[PDB]
């Protein structure tokens, strides 16, 4: 009964299951290692049925939910063990949410027909304000300022949280107990986005100090700092390999890091309305790049504050495809409000036709790993699902989900079922105000909640 | 013809929204109308930026009167939401002011936009 025999036993049982499920067996084994080859191998967009998606908008306790993170156990082929932390957590799906109320909450999303059920929470406050006032003493157990982002460790053993308090605490998933506090060591290094390396313990943190921080969660130790962004790093995304992709916000530059080689690739949009209008013979200049999700190890997508969704390839610096005003134009201001003049025509002149009109921003943008489909979010009140072309040169709008109402702070997708038949559940944290600040005017019908939508595949 | 005049085109707002951000970082920015009013009385402003979608717009039109009296350039940007974001404050800003300092690190582009804004006027 040596471990090699145990691996042989687990492997033998695994093959029997594949044989029971079913050439076909050979193909599935190749698919089990398709992730190592960094290419899209999940083509299921056409099979998705958006129209029959079961939409639900489960609300939550706290105001201005800022981020959500979902944990999905995955069977490891190398050892044939589920990623569940414990036997009790076998095949249990967990989602973690934070808000501006300094509270971290975990929810159970194992049942797709049913809806997330609160398990435990931890709330911070003024009790945790540091007395020393020197940064390195920022080792308090709880939060004392707004929470912005969350990441769940792929091992299912830890969840990490960060915000405007210049720190990074990692909590135990089961009890939400803080085990370690990692100060950022910058007066103005406030955590803005957290991304884990898939199936791995490396964490990549984007902070307001224009730098990216790489940590080893098991060792609870900082590894490397990345300089090179010229403005705050709003978003970061990662997959199994260490090519983390980041966006610099007003610098308007998407940036991919080769951590092993200490080399970086610079990507810039460089679109101008003047040429766009001439080639046409309302286009808004891109102001900042706020969201990024990397579809493939050689491709990624970004969302701009001009409502432009741009596709990228590592080979080309310029975007290969763009989708202008994806979420539409913001409703025009009312004439009864624009001016205090009684005469309506005077008020209408102040609307200045369509000059004042501006596009929605891409608050959220998530792509399922190594897949041909990605999801975009805003406060237009509907989640839009897009499919990339087979050649990975353009994408189209698959459909829309209008259940969500409010700003889509952050999006997730979780799947369940057999390999051939997989049911997809989309979790999106919905707030009434934008995560980074309160700039947005209060949207009618906006609510602070987690949006849920279960989508089925048939064909 | 509109009270909102002149209104910068989409390109110009970008450079105007550029300068304000570094001014905020360099502590050379005054945010909000009443601060902008004060700076004009002290005569310590290169120019002042306003949002054309201010609700209502009549509230910020006193700022134009001061500048043209004091021969200061001014311009309107389409969105107060966007202007506040560039200012670095988590709330919408209807009016903002760049304070006078020949000893700014960001002097060059301020005078650059200060040239374009004058041409706009």
């Amino acid at each position: 009964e040596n471990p090699a025999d145990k691996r042989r036993r687990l492997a033998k049982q695994y093959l029997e299951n594949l044989k029971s499920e079913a050439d076909i067996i050979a193909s599935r084994l190749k698919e089990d290692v398709a992730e190592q080859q960094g290419r899209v191998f999940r083509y299921f967009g056409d099979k998705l049925l958006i129209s029959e998606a079961k939409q639900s908008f489960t609300r939550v306790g706290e105001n201005n939910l800022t981020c959500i993170s979902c944990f999905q156990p995955v069977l490891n082929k190398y050892t044939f063990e589920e990623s569940s932390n414990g036997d009790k957590n076998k095949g249990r799906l967990f989602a973690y949410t934070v808000s501006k109320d300094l509270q971290l909450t975990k929810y159970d999303i194992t049942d797709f027909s049913k809806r997330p059920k609160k398990l435990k929470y931890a709330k911070g406050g003024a009790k945790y304000i540091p007395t020393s006032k020197h940064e390195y003493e920022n080792t308090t157990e709880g939060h004392y300022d707004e929470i912005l982002t969350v990441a769940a460790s792929p091992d299912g053993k830890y969840v990490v949280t960060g915000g405007r308090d210049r720190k990074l605490i990692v909590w135990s998933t089961e009890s939400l107990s803080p085990v370690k506090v990692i100060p950022t060591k910058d007066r103005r290094g406030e955590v803005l986005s957290l991304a884990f390396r898939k199936n791995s313990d490396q964490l990549y943190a984007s902070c307001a100090d224009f730098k990216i921080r790489t940590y080893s969660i098991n060792q609870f130790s900082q590894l490397e700092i990345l300089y090179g962004h010229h403005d705050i790093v709003e978003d970061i995304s990662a997959l199994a390999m260490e090519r983390c992709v980041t966006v610099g916000a007003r610098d308007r530059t998407a940036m991919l890091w080769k951590i092993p080689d200490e080399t970086r690739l610079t990507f810039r949009g460089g679109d101008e309305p003047q040429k766009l209008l001439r080639r046409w013979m309302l286009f808004f200049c891109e102001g900042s790049i706020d969201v990024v999700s990397m579809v493939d190890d050689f491709h990624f997508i970004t969302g701009s504050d001009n409502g432009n969704i741009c596709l990228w390839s590592l080979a080309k610096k310029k975007p290969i495809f763009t989708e202008r005003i994806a979420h539409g134009i913001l409703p025009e201001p009312s004439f009864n409000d624009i001016s205090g003049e009684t005469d309506e025509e005077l008020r209408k002149r102040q609307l200045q036709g369509k000059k004042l009109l501006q596009p929605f921003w891409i608050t959220s943008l998530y792509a399922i790993p190594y897949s041909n489909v990605f999801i975009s979010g805003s406060w237009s009140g509907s989640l839009k699902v897009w499919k990339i072309s087979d050649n990975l040169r353009s994408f189209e709008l698959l459909g829309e989900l209008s259940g969500a109402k409010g700003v889509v702070t952050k999006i997730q997708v979780v799947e369940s079922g057999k390999h051939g038949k997989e049911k997809f559940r989309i979790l999106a944290s919905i707030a009434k105000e934008h995560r980074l600040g309160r700039w947005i005017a209060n949207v009618s019908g906006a609510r602070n909640g987690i949006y849920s939508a279960v989508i089925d595949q048939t064909g | 013809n509109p009270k909102a005049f002149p209104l910068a085109d989409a390109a110009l707002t970008q450079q105007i929204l550029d300068v304000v951000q570094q001014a905020a970082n360099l502590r050379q920015l005054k945010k909000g109308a009443n601060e902008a009013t004060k700076t004009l009385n002290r005569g310590i402003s290169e120019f002042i930026i306003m949002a054309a979608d201010c609700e209502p717009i009549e509230i910020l039109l006193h700022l134009p009167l001061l500048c043209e009296d004091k021969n200061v350039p001014y311009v309107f940007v389409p969105s107060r939401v966007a202007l506040g974001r560039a200012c670095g404050v988590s709330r919408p800003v209807i009016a903002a002011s760049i304070t006078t300092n020949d000893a700014s690190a960001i002097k060059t582009q301020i005078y650059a936009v200060k040239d374009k804004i004058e041409t706009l006027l």
Binding site: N336, S339, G340, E341, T342, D343 | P56, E58
Partner: peptide
């Protein structure tokens, strides 16, 4: 305003009234 109205004046006072109750 060349011909000012009272529509805004009403809501501003209502804003003050809400503040008055709060304090």
């Amino acid at each position: 305003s060349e011909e000012p109205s009272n529509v805004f004046g009403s809501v501003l006072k209502k804003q003050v009234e809400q503040r008055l109750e709060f304090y």
